Amino acid sequence: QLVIQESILMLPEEVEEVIGNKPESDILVHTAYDESTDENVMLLTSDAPEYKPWALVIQDSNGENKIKML
């Protein structure tokens, strides 16, 4: 169902800068966009081949982030 459209690799610092918490390794920002509610659903996981969930961040039409640690 939830169709992930892209998966961007980021570094601990780039994610800390947004999340406020620092991931202990590379992060994969998995994004699924929602045409309608105009929402971006993002699943941050560790790098391959584990894909161990790190955080979940929901963002609205004007960039507010609703972060949640997994």
């Binding site: 992930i4 459209q5 892209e6 961007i8 690799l9 980021m10 994610v15 966009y33 971006n40």
Partner: protein
């Protein structure tokens, strides 16, 4: 001219192996992405000498029918991805000539000298950054060096700490090197959307007298 950074690299073991390990995986049963027919599109749509601007991307789209060889660009009907959608926001705001297309096919930019390079050229369906240990980077690293060696005045549009910096130490005064945060929604805001890369990248071309780039997509056949 791609019969440069190719003639001997393409014979070198590291790249020779990266190819077959991919080939086997394919026939072995796993569906690997950019169909072996599309794998090298970047170098096809834009030649070494035409490279006016250089945009670095990570690895191909791992879902069905999305990727076709160009970084960021999707096929003529696939949903516009979050980052490409954002690149559009910046564009429809920065370049007042514009309006947005209706698709993510960027081959038009491609034939206008915009090199859309992924640092890792293949990916396993469903598994992001899975082919990141075969040798696509060392080949792709070669490519950048060559652009930095045999060319003058190229604009390197480097987005994200991974592409910019890390995989991008170009001659700052032999080539223009603009940096900024990744267009990804977990990043575009609070720090990216304010840059004027597209306008700046055209601004310095007219400056050299070079014909500028038309960032307005299109849609051939």
């Amino acid at each position: 001219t791609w019969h440069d950074v190719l003639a001997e690299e393409k014979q070198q073991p590291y790249f020779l192996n990266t190819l077959q390990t991919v080939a086997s995986e394919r026939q072995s049963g796993v569906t690997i992405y950019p169909p072996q027919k599309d794998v090298f599109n970047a170098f096809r749509f834009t030649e070494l000498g035409d490279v006016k601007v250089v945009i670095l991307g990570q690895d191909p789209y791992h879902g069905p029918g999305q990727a076709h060889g160009l970084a960021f660009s999707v096929r003529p009907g696939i949903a516009i991805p979050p980052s490409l959608l954002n690149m559009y926001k910046e564009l429809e705001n920065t370049i007042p000539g514009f309006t947005r297309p209706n698709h993510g096919y960027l081959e038009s930019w491609a034939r206008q000298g915009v090199l859309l390079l992924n640092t890792v050229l293949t990916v396993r369906a469903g598994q992001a950054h899975s082919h990141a240990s075969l040798g696509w980077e060392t080949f792709t690293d070669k490519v950048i060096s060559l652009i930095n060696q045999h060319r003058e005045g190229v604009v390197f549009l480097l987005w994200g700490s991974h592409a910019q910096k890390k995989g991008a130490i170009i001659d700052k005064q032999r080539h223009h090197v603009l940096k900024a945060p990744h267009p990804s929604p977990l990043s575009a805001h609070r720090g990216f959307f304010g840059c004027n890369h597209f306008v700046l990248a055209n601004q310095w071309l007219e400056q050299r007298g070079e014909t500028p780039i038309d960032w307005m997509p299109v849609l051939p056949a």
